[PDB]
Design a protein around this ligand. Sequence first.
Ligand SMILES: Brc1cnn2c(NCc3cccnc3)cc(-c3ccccc3)nc12
Length: 279
Amino acid sequence: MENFQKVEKIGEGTYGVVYKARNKLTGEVVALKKIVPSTAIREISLLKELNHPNIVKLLDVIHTENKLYLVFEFLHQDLKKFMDASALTGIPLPLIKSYLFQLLQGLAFCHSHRVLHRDLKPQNLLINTEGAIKLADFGLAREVVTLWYRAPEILLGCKYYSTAVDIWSLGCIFAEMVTRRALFPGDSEIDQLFRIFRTLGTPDEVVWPGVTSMPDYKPSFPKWARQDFSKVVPPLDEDGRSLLSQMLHYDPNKRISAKAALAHPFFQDVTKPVPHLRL
Ligand SMILES: Brc1cnn2c(NCc3cccnc3)cc(-c3ccccc3)nc12
């Protein structure tokens, strides 16, 4: 740790403080996360090999004094801050599409390696001046924590959920980019679940076979009717709404995969614009 000079706290991750820092040696500017069980060390060690242009690079893993420090590549801005900055006119559709496309590429990569993120949220989607967007904290899961992006199968007590939970989260973020308001801003697990039911309809055996057997499912759940996506994410076009609908499928087995999503017609005209970043 004496090999780094802390420049500033750049947030408070779900595992500890995150600092912009400088390598007192090479002068390199990095993101330093302060998080030990052997399982943790081995698993994290695998993460150092999971390299892709849309995944924030894990430079080094420092274990000292029973302390765990993760050294990452540094990115100047996160998607929450950017959405807040583009709140007046909204993020241009071509840039939303680009970002969604890139994130789907990062997801497809991780998923092909059986690595899940599990906690995707605007705060951990990082952007740079070149129009790149990257996933931060991938594989780590394996201040109130936000439930807004949590998949229904997790909320219903599914113990062995899979890659589909990340597609759900990314669907919620896509919607938020488009409308400029959180899709399902729950402030408790039941509030989150009910916000989802009120919009997508209370799930049942017809749309989600086996849902009624889920650990936390209750027959006493109110039965709300599903809303039209046209009302949910105006003025997203038909391609966008169609893709969104597939990313928000209740059944995790019906939920579109990242790889399939990349082939959706929505991306037919994808480009890579440059955002205006005021650092
Ligand atoms: Br790895 C990592 C590399 N950059 N980075 C950033 N940079 C964005 C930024 C830069 C400068 C000032 N404020 C924000 C934020 C978070 C993060 C992730 C989760 C929660 C909080 C922060 N993790 C990282």
